[PDB]
Design a protein around this ligand. Structure first.
Ligand SMILES: [Zn+2]
Ligand SMILES: [Zn+2]
Lengths: 419, 419
């Protein structure tokens, strides 16, 4: 039994049905987690690193995949469909579409760097025994992106693109001069395409980046790719298992095969440099890694169960009213029979309430096994003192006596700073 | 419509390519509108009407659609996926999310206190029509429907319906005043499963709720051939055209056909009554309606271009600084070289800047052309008084001279009103 499957069983995160083999179901909780990760990524891309989200078509004509050469390339690794017969097929990747977007209009050097980002679902057909859990899948969401820029600025872009990664694995996340990840730098093979000039410019720029990075990097000379240099992000498990999550890969083949052009400052037509960018890699896979790392214990913001309120006596009126009040505040929800709707950027916390008639210790225990980030209990003392008893799960000495307000502000100041 | 296409051309909303007929290109501005509408509906369903978002797989075995009953009537325009060098069980693509949610409900044992249990699905849908039957935003192959379903005991039914109507009364009766009611309803009983007197009982409860409604309504033979009664919500067009924006279905067939059950307080298994719900319907279509009605006039909430700053003298440093100050301090963007992450719920505004060297009147030339919702101008008097000149979109005369913070607070208090 995998850790993933186990945590899913416990928290009701995921589902799998034979009617849809290899395709992942997301329950309301897995929903919350997924959507939250995606939201974080979106904010970071749009409001910091300058990416513009687009939504591309899921399926394309055979002729398109033939233009990119990914038709014969992906044979049984890609699904297919027939139309009323042109023989359409489903996109394993976002690349060709994002090339079309660039090609549809006349581009100028002043629009560059032009960066696109797409969260659209991706379907890949793999052997019935090849796919296991979230790591190897059929239908999987990936956060993609592409940078179209003049060579001069390439370095800068790479830098920024790495910074994002640095913020993800080395800052916002646990599990390991001393950093979380190292980098595999993949140089030119013996057989390649595209002029060697821009090739060496690229490679040199990269050598400079990694050199001044401070992060450790393996040279891995000569492996991949005929369309140009790669960078693989490597993070190691607490179990010592080494994982490649995201990859930054320059592509010289698509610009030439899709014939993309941009007006330069010298008023001549030059072909733009394309950069494949990923961070979370496979979102499902990323969630996998997170699961294996935290074994089901989520940071306060990502946690499907943010906190729980337990009254000492189920039949105690004071405690009941107090708890219900705090809940109603923390969840921040509006009645359905009402009219006025919910606004934007208003805070909402899950905050379940246990009304079960069992003993206090029982709800404590069960709620602990349930992973809740914060346990808030109300006894006689809590009632008389008009406060709440709150604790973090991962420490188990906190026990702060806090007012509704103070709690609200604490959770807000939590999701604001993440962690 | 050449309207939607015109607005798409001026605002850079949507793109189309021969290589993908039926699939719409969503790129950055149209994607902004899209994602924002979707976000609104999200918040509303989640923190108000008590819905849980889920993500179902795009691929399902033909066996599923068989067992559901869609493999017969709706298999006509449905799309199939082979992708098999061997069997080839003939997995079909999902035009609709109906069966998936039933799978989700039936997966785990449930009881009476888990109801009403409401899901929602924003997952992409592909329905294949004739090559010429395609209207650009009206009918596509690939589109996103808000969908959603409800599982509740009979006692809950009326309740769940009323609330489900309230949601509508938000979007139409309130939010969008495109034209004391903005809508009227329709009717049902068009191959069905079960007893005739049972379906007639459903028509009795639905007619009973419409009798208790207080809204205009009509009748019709052919709506919702199955699994039971229904209410079609029609909107009178800009000019003399009635459409159907959303549909509310009452389905007694699926619960019995998928063998769904729960445990009533008496500890006996009863068959749940499910309600198919929709509000936005097709988001491409709804978006089309919006485009036609508003012409590219979209309010400050939905607007891709939220505003523009005009430096009456473009070569003046004193004015420029006061401009960029407002820009940077408005969009609230962060440096790309920082390790500083973009927080959540932090406000952001598009608020472009025109440094083009021309007469100020020419930079005002296209503002209301590009359809900016506000026009901000900085002159000498604006620097001396340390404020900005704000001109309202639809107000040809009235303007306000406001400090930065006032523009901030103003915009925030605006987008919070869904203005
Ligand atoms: Zn790519
Ligand atoms: Zn349905």
């Amino acid at each position: 039994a995998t850790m993933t499957s186990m945590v899913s069983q416990r928290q009701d995160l995921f589902m799998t049905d034979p009617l849809s083999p290899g395709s992942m179901f997301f329950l309301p909780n897995g929903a919350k987690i997924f959507n939250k990760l995606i939201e974080f990524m979106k904010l970071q891309q749009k409001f910091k690193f300058g990416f513009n989200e687009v939504v591309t078509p899921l399926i394309y004509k055979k002729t398109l995949w033939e233009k990119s050469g990914h038709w014969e390339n992906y044979a049984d690794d890609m699904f297919k469909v027939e139309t009323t017969k042109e023989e359409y097929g489903l996109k394993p990747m976002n690349c060709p579409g994002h090339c079309l977007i660039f090609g549809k209009k006349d581009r100028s050097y002043n629009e560059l760097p032009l960066r696109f980002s797409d969260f659209s679902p991706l379907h890949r057909n793999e052997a019935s025994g090849a796919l296991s859990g979230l790591t190897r899948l059929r239908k999987f969401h990936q956060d993609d992106g592409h940078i179209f820029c003049t060579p001069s600025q390439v370095k800068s872009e790479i830098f920024n693109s790495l910074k994002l990664i640095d913020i993800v694995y080395n800052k916002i996340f646990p599990f390991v001069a001393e950093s979380n990840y190292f980098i595999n730098f993949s140089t030119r093979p013996d057989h390649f395409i595209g002029d060697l000039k821009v090739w060496n410019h690229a490679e040199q720029v990269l050598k400079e980046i990694l050199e001044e990075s401070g992060k450790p990097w393996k040279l891995n000379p000569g492996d991949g790719a005929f369309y140009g240099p790669k960078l693989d992000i490597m993070v190691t498990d607490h179990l010592r298992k080494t994982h490649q999550v995201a990859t930054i890969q320059l592509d010289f083949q698509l610009p030439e095969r899709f014939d993309l052009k941009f007006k330069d400052q010298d008023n001549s037509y030059k072909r733009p440099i394309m950069i494949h960018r990923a961070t979370f890699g496979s979102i499902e896979r990323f969630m996998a890694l997170l699961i294996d790392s935290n074994e089901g214990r989520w940071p306060f913001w990502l946690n499907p169960y943010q906190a729980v309120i337990i009254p000492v006596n189920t039949k105690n009126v004071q405690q009941l009213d107090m708890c219900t009040a705090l809940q109603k505040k923390l969840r921040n929800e509006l009645e359905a029979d009402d009219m006025e709707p919910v606004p934007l950027n208003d805070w909402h916390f899950n905050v379940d309430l246990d009304i079960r008639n069992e003993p206090v210790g029982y709800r404590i225990k069960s709620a602990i096994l349930k992973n809740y980030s914060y346990l808030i209990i109300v006894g006689d003392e809590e009632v008389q003192l008009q406060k709440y008893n709150i604790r973090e799960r991962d420490n188990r000495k906190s026990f702060e006596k806090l007012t509704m307000s103070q709690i609200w502000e604490k959770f807000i100041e939590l999701e604001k700073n993440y962690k």
